């Protein structure tokens, strides 16, 4: 939830704190067996510094547990400025595309294609680089051989969990985020007799690839911005899955690769399976 | 002999008080319920001292709708507050100040000297 005020009127940085809560911890006045309102099976609280420790221990010592913590000042920040992403941009790579224009593809590719993750100059590839600019490769051909490189599966897929990779995945071969538990369950098979070079050529192939920077357009942003058949919670996971701009998908951090999306909400978009 | 039963209650006039009323705020309080249970928490929490307008505390109770803080952190608000120091604590001694802590923050009064101490 938003928190009000950063900082006690006493000088102390704030944490919000999320547990499950538990009978014990709240109950309602009533006759019969105590019941925490259903409303706040996850409840929240805003401590300062010096009461953390002590909020923390009796909720866990009660059958409570602690979901996660997280200094407020990170909270109650605006939702990122989506102002990059309303309008992507895009970027065609016309055929006798003189030397610049093939350099600016590149770093755009590399770009959306690994997030804003940064990727050094021993990193880089020059071999497919090469091919783009005397032509026989195509852009979109080009994004297959990042995808299908061990430097996207050492970051996106070889850290992080199957249903991790499927968005991470979506995200930046289309800029839509996923609709529907259905497209992870799909993918997530495909994955397991095809194997990972079938799952990538599977976005790439798809239609909605097509439809939108079929070939030779760099992959922009198509999420933030209202497209066919999408569910509207999409719209709503699309600010989870992007945040801000100097935000990245990582291995390298904490934890690094975790689910933006949790599995509950996409389930709300839609179930059959 | 024979005494109604709630006779003993009403000796000793604890009759109101006796079996006592809880007031819970509930979610998407109406506007009316929460100005209750702010009724209520003034009414225990400070004592049943008249709080005049310029008393009242605005910004604590206004982050108490908007569900901002619980009613728990409320009471905490209230209880550090000039006005509840101004009156209990500044002008009473440290025995006066415990035992007026308890009640109401927890209705019992203290049950030995360990405690105050
Ligand atoms: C009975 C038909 C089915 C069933 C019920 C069941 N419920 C729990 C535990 C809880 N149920 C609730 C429900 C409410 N709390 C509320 O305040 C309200 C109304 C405002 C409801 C309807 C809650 C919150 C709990 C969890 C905490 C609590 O005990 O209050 C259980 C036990 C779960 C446990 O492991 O503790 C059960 C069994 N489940 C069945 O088996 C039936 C199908
Ligand atoms: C240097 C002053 C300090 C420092 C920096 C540091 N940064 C990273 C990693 C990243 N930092 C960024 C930064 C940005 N992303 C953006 O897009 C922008 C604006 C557009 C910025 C400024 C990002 C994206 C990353 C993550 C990607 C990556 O690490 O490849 C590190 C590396 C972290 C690691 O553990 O590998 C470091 C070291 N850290 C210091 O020691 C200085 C205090
Ligand atoms: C007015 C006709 C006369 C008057 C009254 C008077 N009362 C006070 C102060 C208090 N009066 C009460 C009384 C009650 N509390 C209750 O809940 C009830 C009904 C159940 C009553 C009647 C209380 C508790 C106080 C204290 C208020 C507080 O806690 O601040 C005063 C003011 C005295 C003071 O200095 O506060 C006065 C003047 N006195 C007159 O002269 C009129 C004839």
Same mark, same amino acid.
Request: aromatic share 10%; net charge neutral; with cysteine.
């Given at each position: 939830?938003?928190?009000?005020?950063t900082s006690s009127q006493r000088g102390g940085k704030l944490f919000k704190v999320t547990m499950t809560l538990s009978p014990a911890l709240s109950h309602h006045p009533? %006759?019969?067996?105590?019941?925490?309102?259903?409303?706040?099976?996850?409840?929240?609280?805003?401590?300062?510094?010096?009461?953390?420790?002590?909020?923390?221990? +009796?909720?866990?010592?009660?059958?409570?547990?602690?979901?996660?913590?997280?200094? $407020? &000042?990170?909270? *109650?920040?605006?939702?990122? &400025?989506?102002?990059?992403?309303?309008? %992507?941009? =895009?970027?065609?790579?016309?055929?006798?595309?003189?030397?610049?224009?093939?350099?600016?593809?590149?770093? $755009?590719?590399?770009? /959306?294609?690994?997030?804003?993750?940064?990727?050094?100059?021993?990193?880089?590839?020059?071999?497919?680089?090469?091919?783009?600019?005397?032509?026989?490769?195509?852009?979109?051909?080009?994004?297959?051989?990042?995808?299908?490189?061990? @430097?996207?599966?050492?970051?996106?897929?070889?850290?992080?969990?199957?249903?991790?990779?499927?968005?991470?995945?979506?995200?930046?071969?289309?800029?839509? *985020?996923?609709?529907?538990?259905?497209?992870?369950?799909?993918?997530? &098979?495909? +994955?397991?007799?095809?194997?990972?070079?079938?799952?990538?050529?599977?976005?790439?192939?798809?239609?909605?690839?097509?439809? $939108?920077?079929?070939?030779?357009?760099? %992959? +922009?942003?198509?999420?933030?911005?209202? /497209?066919?058949?999408?569910?509207?919670?999409?719209?709503?996971?699309?600010?989870?899955?992007?945040?801000?701009?100097?935000?990245?998908?990582?291995?390298?951090?904490?934890?690094?690769? =975790?689910?933006?999306? &949790?599995? =509950?909400? @996409?389930?709300?978009?839609?179930?059959?399976? | 002999?024979?005494?109604?039963?709630?006779?003993?209650?009403?000796?000793?006039?604890?009759?109101?008080?006796?079996?006592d009323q809880a007031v819970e705020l509930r979610p998407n309080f109406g506007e009316a319920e929460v100005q209750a249970v702010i009724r209520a928490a003034y009414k225990?929490?400070?004592?049943?001292?008249?709080?005049?307008? #310029?008393?009242?505390?605005?910004?604590?109770?206004?982050?108490? !709708?908007?569900?901002?803080?619980?009613? !728990?952190?409320?009471?905490?608000?209230? #209880?550090?507050?000039?006005?509840? !120091?101004?009156?209990?604590?500044?002008? #009473?001694?440290?025995?006066?100040?415990?035992?007026?802590?308890?009640?109401?923050?927890?209705?019992? #009064?203290?049950?030995?000297?360990?405690?105050?101490?």
């Amino acid at each position: 939830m938003n928190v009000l005020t950063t900082s006690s009127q006493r000088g102390g940085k704030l944490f919000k704190v999320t547990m499950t809560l538990s009978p014990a911890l709240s109950h309602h006045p009533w %006759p019969s067996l105590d019941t925490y309102e259903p409303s706040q099976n996850s409840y929240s609280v805003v401590v300062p510094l010096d009461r953390l420790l002590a909020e923390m221990t +009796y909720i866990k010592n009660k059958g409570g547990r602690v979901l996660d913590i997280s200094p $407020a &000042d990170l909270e *109650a920040l605006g939702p990122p &400025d989506i102002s990059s992403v309303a309008i %992507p941009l =895009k970027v065609e790579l016309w055929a006798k595309a003189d030397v610049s224009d093939v350099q600016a593809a590149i770093v $755009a590719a590399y770009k /959306q294609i690994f997030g804003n993750t940064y990727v050094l100059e021993s990193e880089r590839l020059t071999s497919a680089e090469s091919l783009l600019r005397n032509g026989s490769i195509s852009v979109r051909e080009f994004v297959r051989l990042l995808a299908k490189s061990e @430097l996207y599966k050492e970051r996106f897929f070889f850290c992080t969990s199957n249903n991790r990779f499927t968005e991470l995945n979506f995200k930046h071969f289309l800029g839509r *985020a996923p609709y529907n538990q259905s497209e992870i369950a799909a993918h997530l &098979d495909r +994955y397991q007799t095809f194997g990972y070079d079938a799952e990538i050529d599977s976005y790439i192939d798809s239609d909605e690839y097509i439809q $939108a920077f079929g070939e030779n357009v760099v %992959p +922009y942003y198509r999420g933030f911005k209202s /497209q066919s058949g999408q569910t509207v919670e999409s719209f709503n996971r699309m600010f989870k899955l992007y945040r801000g701009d100097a935000g990245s998908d990582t291995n390298l951090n904490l934890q690094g690769q =975790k689910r933006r999306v &949790d599995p =509950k909400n @996409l389930l709300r978009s839609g179930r059959g399976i | 002999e024979a005494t109604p039963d709630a006779a003993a209650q009403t000796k000793l006039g604890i009759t109101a008080v006796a079996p006592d009323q809880a007031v819970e705020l509930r979610p998407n309080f109406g506007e009316a319920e929460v100005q209750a249970v702010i009724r209520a928490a003034y009414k225990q929490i400070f004592g049943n001292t008249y709080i005049l307008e #310029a008393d009242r505390v605005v910004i604590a109770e206004s982050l108490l !709708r908007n569900g901002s803080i619980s009613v !728990r952190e409320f009471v905490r608000l209230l #209880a550090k507050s000039d006005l509840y !120091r101004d009156r209990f604590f500044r002008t #009473a001694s440290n025995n006066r100040f415990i035992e007026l802590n308890f009640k109401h923050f927890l209705g019992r #009064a203290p049950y030995s000297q360990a405690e105050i101490g």
